[PDB]
Structures are given as structure tokens and as C-alpha cells.
Amino acid sequence: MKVITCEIAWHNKEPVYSLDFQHGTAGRIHRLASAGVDTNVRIWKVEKGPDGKAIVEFLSNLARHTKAVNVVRFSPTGEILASGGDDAVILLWKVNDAQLNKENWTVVKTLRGHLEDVYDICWATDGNLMASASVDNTAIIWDVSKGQKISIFNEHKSYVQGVTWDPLGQYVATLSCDRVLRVYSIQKKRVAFNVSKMLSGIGAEGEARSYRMFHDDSMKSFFRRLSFTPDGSLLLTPAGCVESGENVMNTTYVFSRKNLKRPIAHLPCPGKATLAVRCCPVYFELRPVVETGVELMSLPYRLVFAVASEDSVLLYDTQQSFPFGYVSNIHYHTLSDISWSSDGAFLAISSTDGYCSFVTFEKDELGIPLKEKPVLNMRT
Amino acid sequence: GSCGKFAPFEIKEHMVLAPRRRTAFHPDLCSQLDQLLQQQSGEFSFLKDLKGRQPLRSGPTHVSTRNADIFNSDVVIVERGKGDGVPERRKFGRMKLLQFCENHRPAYWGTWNKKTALIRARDPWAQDTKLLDYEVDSDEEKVRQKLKAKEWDEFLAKGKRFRVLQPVKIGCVWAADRDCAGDDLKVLQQFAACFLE
Amino acid sequence: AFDDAVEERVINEEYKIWKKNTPFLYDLVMTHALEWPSLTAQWLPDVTRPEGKDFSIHRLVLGTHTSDEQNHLVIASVQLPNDDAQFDASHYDSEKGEFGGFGSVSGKIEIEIKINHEGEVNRARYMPQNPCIIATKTPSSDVLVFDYTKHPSKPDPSGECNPDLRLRGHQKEGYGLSWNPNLSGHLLSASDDHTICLWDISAVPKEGKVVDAKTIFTGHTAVVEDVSWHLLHESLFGSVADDQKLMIWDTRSNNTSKPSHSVDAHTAEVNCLSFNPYSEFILATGSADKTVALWDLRNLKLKLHSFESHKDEIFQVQWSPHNETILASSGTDRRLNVWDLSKIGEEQSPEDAEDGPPELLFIHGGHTAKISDFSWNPNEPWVICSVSEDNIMQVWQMAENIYND
């Protein structure tokens, strides 16, 4: 793998809060979108050079947002660009066929109904339903085609700093600042699972030791961006705390579909707290297996993902216990978001210092892709 | 300017040619010279005029090509640390280079501030004892950071406590790899997952 | 007998003490031992200044003098530190109290082009209008002309040279050779045949290989030791011969046997001459008198001055290109004397007059044999390259506090 840190500020040296690749791309060159405090959403063209170093070409600037833009997400088909910010309105952009722009984008829908800043957005697999988390203690589901609000979850007691949508279309997961993880049934439209506390083994002298799983306001990141696994089997939630002895350690919790009220395991991250989790959309063939009960889940394939903390990025896969990659100390301030490219050749990392970086992988470095992507057992 | 069957001289990318003339062109000069060549009048004494004016000199050859030397600096130097308090370099003069073919000891590249009154340019072999022992010399043989624009901005934000980042990347290390370094394997084992049953 | 042993011992002691005293008198000293002795030495006008480097690269034209081997015309490279890099606070030796240390900084001397040459290279000189064209004087009657771009960088596997031009005007070998700095292609040569030959190679066809003499001058009655064009006049040129005579010739004069001017310059053989670059009227001639005579072209009956600090014959005299009052002279006394004109006839303290005349500025005694030939660097002031008989080439520069002060 290679690391290319960009020495030129994309958003006038203002913090960059979000990143997302155009998932609809099927070739070798990719489209990337960045949101910043400069009230702009910038779309760039990313491709590898002859040597293998990533190169960024500026394509367009979208300045319709009035305040800082906190989240940018592409629809699964890559056709609709969702952008949310401090103005409590989510803009849906599309390519329409403004001097600085090589290509032009225009707003199709202005999703309204939030009262404060929008921090995270998650699309559904079909692309017709959207979910967003905001400062106003509510997570709102949206009819993308209708362009209207369909459901509001106000069970939160603080800011909602992350939302993920089940690829099997059964659950929607929200991570809030009240140290509480909530899982809502997509059909019942109510709270299905509530996960805040964790029993700490056996307490000393027979005590019932229970501690809060997630971090308090000391979190330096606005975001607690958890994510589902592309197959749906696992749910990865950052900003977690584990009390090994008398000290607390930052970690990312891993939950299974079988039971969502207790994690299978936790990936420990000594140092800073983990804030983002993003999965590679490519299913990989299993490595030559040294037979052990190490795998997080036992399926014929495996999935590579990345966990971004305040100052580091850890690169895990499904079957190994330890991460196969680690990068750190490439940015002078807290990281904000991570996004994989469609082919898995790129991992874009954004940080609040104003500069972004890329982690590039050469041909088949992450693994051997499956001949056919497995069919999903969607619930609906 | 091809002379005969020879191609003209090719000036390379970073070449400089010493000037062919050392005086501005005077048109009548040659004609006057011819007159002064025939007259043979002992009126003019050149050595007399030499002491009555300044000697005609010229400097080292410099580059004068159009758009020749144009550069950009993307770095600002920030110096931190007391250092050893070494004296001012300016008062030590030019660094002399003394290298000899027959010397096993490498070339000398350094200043020389020893002072004598007997080692003159008029007499190279003039000895100066009691200051230089005349025996064979070759018997046998804090921080100055160069910040970039991003690091300069971060330094202005933080101050002298700021230090440049040292990126730490660990390559792809798998459980199946056999020749992979064990140090990277243990550093990644520091992040090994912990399971709850 | 004892002569050789005593001379060797004295010369070795003198060289040892000179090397010991070198840091006080020089700012640059580069001693290099060549494969074979060089009878000629000339700085090329090229200086390559690689961007992002602390040094420049100069080039030298040299010859070889092999008793029974294959002779080569050599073009060599010398690395010299840039002026901006000569002030460097790298290390501070707390013991010697200097910003010194031997370190790893060293001047690089390497051979770039070797071309075959039949016989010894008596003198090699490049054409100013085209430094690719180099004329060489052989121990034969013919003068050779090479273009080092038209020859392989390494010598031929065997056999003699393939000269680009062969000029046949003389009957014997010679040592005086000079191009015309105002007329491209005009070459003057002097030989033991008591004559001077002028060639014009500016009209040679592409396939031409032999050029006959355009003009022959027969004024001298002895071995014509040296000839040199005037630096500003396309017609006048001077010559010095073994008949103690210096002759000023005009190419417009039809009498090819009587010079336009004749002067009894010296009391013995006159071996070299050179025109001052800054004065059209002044020139200098080195003789066997152990003297250098200064001549004004407006008054040829009177010798302007005599430099008399040499201890033996003088074979080369060249002016400094960066200072009109600075002159240099080398000879068989293993010394290179540097003279200042602006100090002629100055009052001198009793012990300073012990060293020599006031006009004497510097003495280079780092050579243990006869200085075959030296040359001033046209790009770096006060840098002189001198090659001697014991295959020793020295590129040096005297200390700054000697000339600037």
C-alpha cells in the first residue's frame, strides 16, 4: 500500500468534514466529493498515475449551502449526491447536461424538516429511502423519490452523530452522544434494540460491574459514524470504551445480526478514540487459512474495512484478528471521514486540519475478488 | 558560425562561456593603433599612467541567458535549540581546499586563521618555527527545521512546541506471510481483537 | 653522480616545507599525478554550473609525452567549489579553533576524452570561435587539427590518430601556436625551420583533409620559438625567436621576409610572448636571460621594464584575464612567478627587497620539476593550472589576503 497526503488545501485551509466516492463508477477513474466549513461541496476526479501515486483533478464546486457542510454521501447508484450541513437542509444534487466548474451539478430536492446541523446521512440499498442524523436529537427517514419526510425518531437525548442503513433492509442504527446505541426496526418504525451498558465480566468480591460502552462529550470528533457490513452480517460501532483493569481503553465494538444487544468482540485502539468505520465494497476470497477460531464471522468470503480514530487509520479484514494495515501521524488534527472507492483501489481520509490523504492499493493487494458477488438475503 | 567543415560550438543546458573580449569595442581603435605603430613616438609612458588610475579588472564569469535561472522556494527555515554557541562564522574567512595526490589522508576543506609574520608570499620556503612544527602532517590516518507551507502554518498556530509529523505506515502484513518482519507483526498484534463469550 | 642525489634531496625538502606552508599562501591546492607528463596545458572556456550543486566543472586541454608508448590528446575535467559554498558553518573543530575538518569534500579530477596522437603533444590550443577545434603541434613537420566531438570518447583499439585536418607548412617540429581571435580559421605556427606559417581553414570542404600553408614568413634567422596573434587587430602578430629578436608582422605587408617591426628584445633566446588583454599597446616576452621584458608597441626602441626574479630560463608567459596589472611567468627553475605592474619602482623595506623586486607578487614553488606549461582560468579569477615534467598537474589559487588585502 501507498500513502499520498495532499499538501494543497481543498477548502481554503478550512476543515474538511466528510468524503465519499461515487459508488456508481465501474471503471478505473473515480469521482470523489468533499464537504468543508467553507460552505462548499467540491467534486474531484481521482486516478492513479503511471508510477502508482494518486492524482486529484478538480471538477466542480457546489456553493448553494449557506453554512458549514458536515456530511456528503453518494447514492448507491452514484447518481444522487446528498449533502447536509449546519443549515438543517439536505440538498440532493444531480448532473445537469459558474466559471470554475468543468462539470455542473444542480439541486433536485431540498429535504427539509431538521432543526439543527445534519451530521450523517445513510442511503438504503434500493436508493429510494434515505436516513439522516442531526443535532436536534432526531433521525429522519426520507422518501427520496417523493422528496418528503416519512418518519422521525426523537428517542435520542442528545446529538445524533451517525446513522447506518441495513443492506438487508431490516434495521436502521443510530449512535448518539448520550452513550446509547439504538437500532430501529424498519417496518415497525420503533426502537428494536437499545445498547448502552456493558457488564464487565465478574466484579471484584462478587460485584455486578457494569460500565457505559460509549464515550462521553470528551470526544473531539463531531461524528460517531458506525457502519454495517456490506453483506449485513456485522455492525461496527466506533467510540467505545473497555475497562480492562482500572483504566479505560478506546475500542470499536462488533455486533452480529444474531443478537444486537451484546457485541461479539471489540477491536482495541490504544491512544485516541475511534470515530469512523467504512467498509470496502469488494468481496474477497479467503486467504490461505491457518485454521483457528479467529474469524469474526465464518462465511466463504471476507471483507476488508477501515476504522479511523482521531489520528490513525486501522485496516482490518474479516478473518484475521489483528489489522493488516496501520497508518498514523499524517494529519495535524482530528480525522473526520473515510471512504473507499468502488473498486477498492482507494481509501480517502479527511481531517479537520484542512488537508486530505489517500491510501492506494495495487492490483489484488487487498485480496482476490470473488468471481460473483454473493446474493443478499434481504428481509423486506 | 560554422567554420569550414566543422559544426558550430554547441552550448549545453547549464554551460557558460568566458567572454572573448575584455574591453568595449572602439571603432577607430585599430586605425589609431596603426598610426601609433608607425609613429614610434616615445611620448607615451604606460607605466606612468598605471599608477595614476585604477587597474582594469573583470569579475568571474556569470550567467546572462534569457530566462536562465528562475527558481521557487516552498520552505521557510525555523531554528530551535540553544546549540553549542559556536562563534560567528563570518569572522573565520573563506574555507580553503587543500588536496594532495600523494596524501593518504583525505582532502582538507576548512578555514585557516593562524597568523604569522614570516610565511610570506614572496618566499614560500620561508620557515616559521615555534608556531608550526615542521613535521609530516600525514603521518597516519540545535535543530534547523525546513518547514513547508502546511507545516509553517501549523508552527505559527502552535509555536516552538510544534514539531513536524513523522508518518507511520505499516505495509500489508497477513497471518499467512512467512518472511514478513516480526516487528510489524507485533505492532499490529497490539490492536488484536478481543472476543467476549 | 652526487648531482642527482643532492638535487633530489634538496628538492624533496623544499617541496615538504612548501606543502607545510601551503595553508598560509593558498586558498586552493589540487595536486594530481597524470599517467604521462604533459607538455601543454590550456583551460577551456566551458564552465558547466549544474543547478542545485555547490561546484562548477571546468575543462582542460592537455597532452602526453610517452617515450615509447601511444600518445594522447587529453581533455580532462576539474570540479571547483562555488564561491557561495566557500562559506559554510558545517563543523567547528573545538581543538584547532577552525571551521575545518577534512571531511569528505574533495575536488574531482578525471579524464573525459582521450584521442590518439602520433608523437608527443608539444602544444595543444583550441580555436576561440569554436572550442571544439583543437590544433596540436607534433614532433613532425605537420600541424594537426582535431574536433573532439568527431572522435570516440575512448581511444581507437590500435593504430595512430585520424586527424580532421593536416596542415603542411614547415620542415621541422615547433612549439609556438596561436589562433586568430578576430579571423575565424586563421592559424599561426612557428617551428625550428626558421619560418612562421599561416593557414586559413575557414574554406575547407567537408571531405577535405589536407591544407597547404597560406603564407610563410621568413624574417627570423634562428629557431622561431613562439608566435602569437594580436588580441584586437586582425592583421598584426608578434613572434619571438632564438635570434634574441621579437618581430611585429603585418599580414597586409607584402614582404614575407621582413617584418613590419624588428626589436633586439633580449641577450639570449626568447621563448615566449603574450599580449595584454586590456591594453592594445602592451605585451611581454620571456627570455633565457631569466627575465621578462615589457614592451610598448608605441615605443619599441625602449624596453618598458625587466622582471628579474627568475633563477633559470623562462618558457611561458601569460597575462591574467581578470587584471591588467597581473602577469605570470614559468620556466625551468621549477617556479611560477606572479608579478604586479602597479608596484613597479616602489620603495621597499630592507628585508622585503631580500625576497625580490617590488613588482614580484607571488611565488609558486609546489613543482618539483620544470614547469612545462601553465594557464590562467578565464572563468575563475586567480586560478592557475600548471603542468610540469614529472607528470604533475596542479590547479591552485593563492590566498585572498595576498592580492585583495
Curated annotation (Swiss-Prot), chain A:
Q: Family per UniProt?
A: Belongs to the WD repeat HIR1 family.
**Gene Ontology biological-process entries:** DNA repair; DNA replication; DNA replication-dependent chromatin assembly; nucleosome assembly
Give the superkingdom in one word: Eukaryota
Protein name per Swiss-Prot or TrEMBL: Chromatin assembly factor 1 subunit B
Major subcellular location class = nucleus
- Record has Signal as a keyword: no
- Signal peptide location in the record? none
Protein's cellular compartments: Nucleus; Cytoplasm
Q: Name one GO molecular function term.
A: chromatin binding
Keywords (A to Z) from UniProt: Acetylation, Cell cycle, Chaperone, Chromatin regulator, Cytoplasm, DNA damage, DNA repair, DNA replication, Nucleus, Phosphoprotein, Repeat, WD repeat
Query: What post-translational events are described?
Result: Differentially phosphorylated during cell cycle. During mitosis the p60 subunit of inactive CAF-1 is hyperphosphorylated and displaced into the cytosol. Progressivly dephosphorylated from G1 to S and G2 phase. Phosphorylated p60 is recruited to chromatin undergoing DNA repair after UV irradiation in G1, S or G2 phases.
Q: Phosphothreonine modification sites?
A: 380
Q: Does the keyword Acetylation apply?
A: yes
- Fragment boundaries within the full protein? 1 to 394 of 559
Q: Name one GO cellular component term.
A: chromatin
* Disulphides: none
| Species this chain originates from | Homo sapiens (Human)
Function, in words: Acts as a component of the histone chaperone complex chromatin assembly factor 1 (CAF-1), which assembles histone octamers onto DNA during replication and repair. CAF-1 performs the first step of the nucleosome assembly process, bringing newly synthesized histones H3 and H4 to replicating DNA; histones H2A/H2B can bind to this chromatin precursor subsequent to DNA replication to complete the histone octamer.
WD repeat start-end pairs: 11-54, 64-97, 113-152, 155-194, 214-265, 285-326, 330-371
Assembly, per entry: Subunit of the CAF-1 complex that contains RBBP4, CHAF1B and CHAF1A. CHAF1A binds directly to CHAF1B. Only minor amounts of RBBP4 are complexed with CHAF1A and CHAF1B in G1 phase. In G2 and S phase also monomeric CHAF1B is detected. Interacts with histones H3.1, H3.2 and H3.1t.
UniProtKB/Swiss-Prot annotation, chain B:
Entry's localization field: Nucleus
Quick one: where is this thing mainly located? nucleus
Gene Ontology terms describing biological process: DNA repair; DNA replication; DNA replication-dependent chromatin assembly; nucleosome assembly
Indicate whether Ubl conjugation appears among the record's keywords. yes
Q: Does the keyword rRNA processing apply?
A: no
Q: Which GO terms describe its cellular component?
A: CAF-1 complex; chromatin; nucleus; protein-containing complex
Molecular function (Gene Ontology), one example = chromo shadow domain binding
Mind listing the UniProt keywords for this protein, alphabetically? Cell cycle, Chaperone, Chromatin regulator, DNA damage, DNA repair, DNA replication, Isopeptide bond, Nucleus, Phosphoprotein, Ubl conjugation
For domains, the record's comment is: Contains one Pro-Xaa-Val-Xaa-Leu (PxVxL) motif, which is required for interaction with chromoshadow domains. This motif requires additional residues -7, -6, +4 and +5 of the central Val which contact the chromoshadow domain.
Subunit organization: Homodimer. Part of the CAF-1 complex that contains RBBP4, CHAF1B and CHAF1A. CHAF1A binds directly to CHAF1B. Only minor amounts of RBBP4 are complexed with CHAF1A and CHAF1B in G1 phase. Interacts with PCNA; the interaction is direct. Interacts (via the PxVxL motif) with CBX5; the interaction is direct. Interacts with MBD1. Interacts with histones H3.1, H3.2 and H3.1t.
> Into which family does the record put it?
Belongs to the CHAF1A family.
Protein's job: Acts as a component of the histone chaperone complex chromatin assembly factor 1 (CAF-1), which assembles histone octamers onto DNA during replication and repair. CAF-1 performs the first step of the nucleosome assembly process, bringing newly synthesized histones H3 and H4 to replicating DNA; histones H2A/H2B can bind to this chromatin precursor subsequent to DNA replication to complete the histone octamer. It may play a role in heterochromatin maintenance in proliferating cells by bringing newly synthesized cbx proteins to heterochromatic DNA replication foci.
Q: What is this protein called?
A: Chromatin assembly factor 1 subunit A
Q: Which organism is it from?
A: Homo sapiens (Human)
**Gene (UniProt):** CHAF1A
- Which part of the full protein is shown? 463 to 713 of 956
From Swiss-Prot, chain C:
Summarizing the annotation, the consequence of altering residue 175 to A is: Loss of interaction with ZNF827 and loss of localization to telomeres
N6-acetyllysine: residues bearing it = 154
Q: Offer one Pfam family short name for this entry.
A: WD40
Function of the protein:
Core histone-binding subunit that may target chromatin assembly factors, chromatin remodeling factors and histone deacetylases to their histone substrates in a manner that is regulated by nucleosomal DNA. Component of the chromatin assembly factor 1 (CAF-1) complex, which is required for chromatin assembly following DNA replication and DNA repair. Component of the core histone deacetylase (HDAC) complex, which promotes histone deacetylation and consequent transcriptional repression.
> What is the scientific name of the source organism?
Homo sapiens
- Gene name linked to the record: RBBP4
Q: Which GO terms describe its molecular function?
A: histone binding; histone deacetylase binding; RNA polymerase II cis-regulatory region sequence-specific DNA binding
Entry's localization field: Nucleus; Chromosome, Telomere
The name this protein goes by in its record = Histone-binding protein RBBP4
Q: What tissue expression does the UniProt record report for this protein?
A: Expressed in neuroblastoma cells.
